[PDB]
Amino acid sequence: MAAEPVEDNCINFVAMKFIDNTLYFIAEDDENLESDYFGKLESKLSVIRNLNDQVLFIDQGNRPLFEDMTDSDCRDNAPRTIFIISMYKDSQPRGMAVTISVKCEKISTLSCENKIISFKEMNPPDNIKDTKSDIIFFQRSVPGHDNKMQFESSSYEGYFLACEKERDLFKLILKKEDELGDRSIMFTVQNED
């Protein structure tokens, strides 16, 4: 809740919101840090934790089953927001290609079309070969952190997912690796073993 006056240069997310097809993040200690951490934006990190079952990882063959991962009850409220990381086995024979999606009332897929972060009511592609790169991501590590994971668009190499603070919530934006820090912080995800 309360935040410490430290230069750990990392914000932790513990909750999310999906509003008008826009993805928001809630910090663990979003009472103090909002006006403390952001005096010296030296390309600082943020990471989301799966401590509330809010991050979903796909191994392979569950990728196309997103439709069946939704709820049918409490339709007036819809299910909580879950952030999805997909993986391919066929794409990137010498790496790892991914797509980013969110689960809610519907299944939403993240696009970086025109370097703009937007969500579309569509299922994820089967591969990166016959698919528009605008909706394809590549999986990268963070240079200095193992647990932290970051994503960049296929269309625009060097452009990574980032978070931006509007008033209290954080929203998902696209920023160049060199741009990160210009009123922005890096969005990362905590992996699992």
Curated annotation (Swiss-Prot):
Result after altering M186A: Reduces binding of the preformed binary complex of IL18 and IL18R1 to IL18RAP
Impact reported for K148A: Abolishes binding of the preformed binary complex of IL18 and IL18R1 to IL18RAP
GO biological process terms held by the UniProt record: angiogenesis; cell population proliferation; cell-cell signaling; cellular response to lipopolysaccharide; cholesterol homeostasis; cytokine-mediated signaling pathway; defense response to Gram-positive bacterium; establishment of skin barrier
Subcellular location, principal: cytoplasm
Database matches in InterPro entries: IL-18, IL-1_fam, IL1/FGF
GO molecular function, one term: interleukin-18 receptor binding
Propeptide: 1-36
Cellular component, GO, one term: extracellular space
Keywords, sorted A to Z: Cytokine, Cytoplasm, Inflammatory response, Secreted
Induction: In macrophages, release is increased by endocannabinoid anandamide/AEA.
Domain of life: Eukaryota
SS bond list: none
Site positions per UniProt: Cleavage: D36, Y37, D71, S72
Outcome of substituting D168A: Reduces binding to IL18R1 and the ability to induce IFNG production
Outcome after substituting D36A: Abolished processing by CASP1 or CASP4 or CASP5 and maturation
Post-translational modification (record): The pro-IL-18 precursor is processed by CASP1, CASP4 or CASP5 to yield its mature, active form. The pro-IL-18 precursor features autoinhibitory interactions between the propeptide and the post-cleavage-site region, preventing recognition by the IL18R1 receptor. Processing by CASP1, CASP4 or CASP5 induces conformational changes to generate critical receptor-binding sites. The mature form is then secreted and released in the extracellular milieu by passing through the gasdermin-D (GSDMD) pore. In contrast, cleavage by CASP3 inactivates IL18.
Annotated consequence of substituting K40A: Reduces binding to IL18R1 and the ability to induce IFNG production
Keyword Transmembrane: no
Entry's localization field: Cytoplasm, Cytosol; Secreted
Family affiliation: Belongs to the IL-1 family.
Complex and partners: Forms a ternary complex with ligand-binding receptor subunit IL18R1 and signaling receptor subunit IL18RAP at the plasma membrane. Mature IL18 first binds to IL18R1 forming a low affinity binary complex, which then interacts with IL18RAP to form a high affinity ternary complex that signals inside the cell. Interacts with cargo receptor TMED10; the interaction mediates the translocation from the cytoplasm into the ERGIC (endoplasmic reticulum-Golgi intermediate compartment) and thereby secretion.
Role: Pro-inflammatory cytokine primarily involved in epithelial barrier repair, polarized T-helper 1 (Th1) cell and natural killer (NK) cell immune responses. Upon binding to IL18R1 and IL18RAP, forms a signaling ternary complex which activates NF-kappa-B, triggering synthesis of inflammatory mediators. Synergizes with IL12/interleukin-12 to induce IFNG synthesis from T-helper 1 (Th1) cells and natural killer (NK) cells.
Protein's recorded name: Interleukin-18
Species of origin: Homo sapiens
